[PDB]
Design a protein around this ligand. Structure first.
Ligand SMILES: CC(C)Nc1cc(Cl)nn2c(-c3ccc4n[nH]cc4c3)cnc12
Length: 377
């Protein structure tokens, strides 16, 4: 009970799902890879680990057999029935890397959605990845079957309709924008419940109610996602921009940014654009007095003249106690914690808006070589 066509092999017993016009997909094999095999009546390279691969096509006297990179599940399955080593941020990163690659090839997906973002079978290293695919897979009620289609609409894909209702790359960034929130909110949409999304979208009526206003990780996510789903397409950042966002930075890269703008400043004028732009609106960020809001053993060690309401001075202080982290009393090293992880969290947990504030403020130096890893050109 095993059909062999060319390099493609499969067992007819193993049906993975069904499509249109007698289209079937089987669990199969190719080049010793576990692949999906779509047998179809015939109609009339530059790859990336995060776009689904189309390996091989083979024909008999009737059908065409296409070998597709096999997936373990659907993103909507990952997010909803969350009983699944790979974390949500890395998932989104891989997805954006795929999407950025497609965009470099002047390709636009037009229908990016949780059913389109596939979860790979674990490779030989036990690693799992995100895969952007043409066809979305859908909940069938059996074991184990799936619906596949390359169309928006179709049951049950509603709630995720092609935002084009000539498309530019901005329809994709908008789509991903919703997926980002879909993943972070563990299964909610930025424009509300299914029936009202279309109405809310067309009016830009979004609500990121899962992103707490005073929590650093949520604040950072909100900044990006808001811009991604911007009502005006021309306020939306390219896929490469999204990759540069602090949303994806490691705790080390975060702290390094902080230290970078700090170093960039200490010779600035306090009257000039750079520092003034950084201080505008910075009292809520610093919490009026940031010496009032850090742990007791630390403000004792500062007792230097840092302006308690100045963002610049806060950043300057963070820099010094990192540059002198070895020369510090053991009391203030254990309150600051390790470097950089505990160290940068020492502040961002207390000053939830510091990074996002400093990030947007320091766009005045985005064109500089110092801030190349933090901004896109
Ligand atoms: C074991 C299940 C969860 N894996 C898959 C089931 C189905 Cl129905 N399709 N599929 C694909 C797939 C991916 C792309 C396709 N284009 N046309 C048909 C396609 C099928 C990849 N991994 C699976």
């Amino acid at each position: 009970s095993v059909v062999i066509v060319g390099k493609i092999s499969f067992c007819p017993k193993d049906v993975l799902g069904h499509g249109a016009e007698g289209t079937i997909v089987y669990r199969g094999m190719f080049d010793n890879r576990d692949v999906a095999v779509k047998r179809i009546l015939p109609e009339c390279s530059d790859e990336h680990p995060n776009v689904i691969r189309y390996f091989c096509t083979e024909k008999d006297r009737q059908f065409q057999y296409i070998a597709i990179e096999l997936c373990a599940a659907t993103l909507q399955e990952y997010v909803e029935q969350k009983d699944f080593g790979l974390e949500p941020i890395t998932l989104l990163q891989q997805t954006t890397s795929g999407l950025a690659h497609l965009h470099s090839l002047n390709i636009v997906h037009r229908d990016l959605k949780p059913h389109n973002i596939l979860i790979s079978m674990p490779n030989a290293h036990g690693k799992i990845k995100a895969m952007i695919s043409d066809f979305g897979l859908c909940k069938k009620l059996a074991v184990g079957r799936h619906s596949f289609s390359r169309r928006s609409g179709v049951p049950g894909t509603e709630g995720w309709i092609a935002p084009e209702m000539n498309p530019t790359y901005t329809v994709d960034i908008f789509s991903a924008g919703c997926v980002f929130y879909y993943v972070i909110s563990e299964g909610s949409h930025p424009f509300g419940k299914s029936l009202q999304r279309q109405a809310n979208i067309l009016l830009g009526a979004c609500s990121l109610d899962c992103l707490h206003p005073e929590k650093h990780e949520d604040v950072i996510a909100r900044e990006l996602i808001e811009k991604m789903i911007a009502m005006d397409p021309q306020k939306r950042p390219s896929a490469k921009h999204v990759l540069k966002h602090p949303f994806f930075w490691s705790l080390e890269k975060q702290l390094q940014f902080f230290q970078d703008v700090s170093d960039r400043i200490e010779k600035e004028s306090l009257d000039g654009p750079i520092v003034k732009q950084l201080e505008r609106g910075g009292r809520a960020v610093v919490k009026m007095d940031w010496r009032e809001n850090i742990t007791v053993p630390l403000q004792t060690d500062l007792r230097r003249t840092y302006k308690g309401g100045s963002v610049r001075d806060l950043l300057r202080a963070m820099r010094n106690k990192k540059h002198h982290y070895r020369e510090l009393p053991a009391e203030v090293r254990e309150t600051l914690g390790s470097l950089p992880d505990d160290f940068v969290c020492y502040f961002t947990s207390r000053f939830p808006h510091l990074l996002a504030h400093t990030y947007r403020a320091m766009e005045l130096c985005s064109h500089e070589r110092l801030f190349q890893p933090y901004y896109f050109h």
